[model samples]
Target: VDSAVRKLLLEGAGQPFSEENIIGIYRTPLVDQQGRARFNLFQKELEATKMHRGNANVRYAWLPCSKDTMEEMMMRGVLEVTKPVYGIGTHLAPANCAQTCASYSDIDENGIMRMMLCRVIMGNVEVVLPGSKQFQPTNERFDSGVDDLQKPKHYIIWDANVHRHIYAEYAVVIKAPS
Candidate 1:
């Protein structure tokens, strides 16, 4: 089943429909003048690519905000909340094996801080071919992402299985008007 799934996914290589796309929806918390929290929706986009071996490509784009919103946040010495943030997507192999994904967040004077996250193997699901179950069988692994940041200046390396695709997303959160 594993070999079959790889074959199926590989057969579409280099084609327009070869890539698997997953859309990520995110919400950014709003901030008040005092750097307090407010309420609003901050939308962003995440694109995933599976062409790389042992790694998945991820891209994030920030949307625009109004000048008034920016000025209000700046007065409080706070930055505007960026969309798409930072995160990782993972595809795992069957069994109890694990994998890792690493990311970083910025601090004013502390410099770069690293973050590590982990995903556990949750077995596989069988998929039948379009017409018949006997014709072709495929298995997909299940996994989840977790935040592993423990201390300041320390980075997190998430454990993930290289057999599947993994994508990362990242963003900075700040107190600002939406």
Candidate 2:
């Protein structure tokens, strides 16, 4: 088992899963070298993302989901490539978003949870609360929006192309005790 992957999950979920709990891990390739360079160049200019708590630099962000959802993404190798309708579009929130207990509870009866360990570039973030059907940022000054400044519960990215800002690096299949 990969210890780094284990650390990432613990950091995001605030709990430990033994080697047996890990079903499998798959490398999800996204954003070619050119795309990576483009993102890096853009990230160089933007202000570093400051969170209410820990490290701010974009590294690993997690999203816990069901087997079906994970399987669907594993097949397509993408998330929200199409336009989103929800108030919070393709969000690139902090890892702590997954730290909440509710994040793990969303898994199905199989006690299986698939987490996408994403590399997100949360540049120039703006904080806000809930709103009805808000698609993008309220002002042009911000690159993204977070639900809370101190403890962000949600994130939103309203730009034209989202692939530039975030991408999935790995899909971790985990089994939780029911």
Candidate 3:
């Protein structure tokens, strides 16, 4: 095995060695578009079967799109990030945004009644840079007194008046260990 793969194995020892342990890496080069570097992010689904305990059963691959290709796809209305790019699920909801879960939930209504739930049916969407800006009309508004550039990396906007929310999802199947 190559050094990188070897390193992964060594680091992953004693952990579950199934397909779910595999990770995909994708990259896109920075290119100039009208004197500004532009980057586009895309996602793809991964499929795996015949899962066995202590044996890898998940498959993952990275899908990187070039600037020109992304532009073309976007122009053709074929590259919306709202699509279900990657996921794992059951009959009720069988697809996750970005192949990972962004949130989860559960409920217990009474002593004898209980329920489990997860927000795994949604899809992940992309947001371009220089997102949105919104203004509120509340008189109690106090200046945050913080520079926009100093905001956290997680803060992002999509349009002039809208913000973007992105997340991933995946499913789990319980079976007897082989």
Best candidate according to TM-score:
2
Per-residue CA lDDT of model 3 for 68-91, tens digit only, reads 333433343222221111111111
For model 1, give the RMSD to the true fold.
20.1
lDDT of 3: 0.21
Better structure of 2 and 3 per TM-score: 2
List model 2 lDDT by residue over 42-118, tens digit each.
Answer: 35433344432233446456655556656555665445432212264664435555444234335666777666666
Candidate 1's TM-score: 0.15
Q: For residue 160, what is the lDDT in candidate 2?
A: 49
RMSD of each: 20.1, 5.7, 18.1
How well does model 1 score by local distance difference test? 0.24
Greater TM-score among 1 and 3 belongs to: 3
- For all predicted structures, in order, the TM-scores are 0.15, 0.66, 0.20
- How large an RMSD does model 3 have? 18.1
Q: Write the per-residue lDDT of candidate 1 for residues 1-178, one digit (tens) a residue.
A: 2232223223523321122221112222245355544322111111122222222322121222233333333344233321112132222211111011111223223232221111222122232222231311122332222222231111111234322221112122222111
